[PDB]
Design a protein around this ligand. Structure first.
Ligand SMILES: [Zn+2]
Lengths: 129, 134
DNA sequence: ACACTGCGAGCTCGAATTC
DNA sequence: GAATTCGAGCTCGCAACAATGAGCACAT
């Protein structure tokens, strides 16, 4: 998969098999985004509005994601009637880079637009579907 | 400024409707072009709506009265050389166009016969289901 | 020198159990 | 390993589109 600080460039098309083998020899791969200082990406004006108050179980899940001031690629399992979507908007409101939301159905993308307009203060020219 | 005869002119029938620098002296009514309507550019040269207004450069049209309505709506007209230049840009060569039309022109008669077997398999299902049971 | 917005067709997947 | 049942999505063709009413503010 190819092609102090030693590095070697890996192929994008088989990044899945590299993560399989790196666990297979107990040197696992982390995905800690260090988002406070990257200087390449145009930080957008997503800001969480002071109307979406988040419950203490949602504040505990986001505290384990943004641990040391650096975002972390994980899986958060909350019930659907619980705040499963507000934690998604608050995580996009905290990294504050180009989010990309994926859903299973064409009805589900009609809801994530309706949640980003409720708690995140975005114009209609930036929530594209 | 022209390209066919190279004469300097202010305006003509062209270059304000289609952006083509061609003088109005000859105008080539049946020589270089005709005025093809919008519905003929969809079923003959087989272009979708993502070919006449999104492929750069986007070409424009001319609105006119409908001939057999006179009170209803529009009738768009395109320039004929602008369409066959777009069909060569979207569909490779000219000998890929008609060859793609053969597999498309059989899809409607394929629908004509596949309508006639689902009409058999449904009407026979209403009478076979009463004799298979006991 | 006709023709806008809706809508069932193939095509290809998925989850889970079948044959 | 190669079928099914019922669901989903994206392309794209198909057929046929419409458009009816009534009055006071500003210059020499
Ligand atoms: Zn000329």
């Amino acid at each position: 998969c190819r092609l102090q600080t030693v590095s070697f460039e890996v192929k994008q098309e088989m990044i899945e098999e590299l993560q399989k083998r790196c666990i297979h020899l107990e040197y696992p791969l982390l995905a800690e985004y260090d988002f406070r200082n990257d200087s390449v990406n145009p930080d957008i004006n997503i800001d969480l509005k002071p109307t979406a108050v988040l419950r203490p179980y949602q504040e505990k899940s986001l505290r384990k994601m943004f641990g040391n001031g650096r975002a972390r690629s994980g899986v958060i399992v909350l019930p659907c009637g619980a705040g499963k979507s507000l934690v998604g908007v608050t995580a996009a409101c905290t990294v504050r880079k180009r989010c990309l939301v994926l859903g299973n159905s064409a009805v589900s993308v009609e809801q994530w637009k309706a949640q980003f307009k409720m708690w995140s203060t975005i114009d209609d020219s930036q929530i594209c579907r | 400024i022209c390209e066919e005869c190279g004469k300097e002119f202010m305006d003509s029938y062209l270059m304000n409707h289609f952006d083509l620098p061609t003088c109005d002296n000859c105008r080539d009514a049946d020589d270089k072009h005709k005025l093809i309507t919008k519905t003929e550019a969809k079923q003959e040269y087989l272009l979708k709506d993502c070919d006449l207004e999104k492929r750069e450069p986007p070409l424009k049209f001319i609105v006119k009265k409908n001939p057999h309505h006179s009170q209803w709506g529009d009738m768009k007209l395109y320039l004929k050389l602008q369409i066959v230049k777009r069909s060569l840009e979207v569909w490779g060569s000219q000998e890929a166009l008609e060859e793609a039309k053969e597999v498309r022109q059989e899809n409607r008669e394929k629908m004509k016969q596949k309508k006639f077997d689902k009409k058999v398999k449904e009407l026979r299902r209403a009478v076979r289901s009463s004799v298979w049971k006991r």
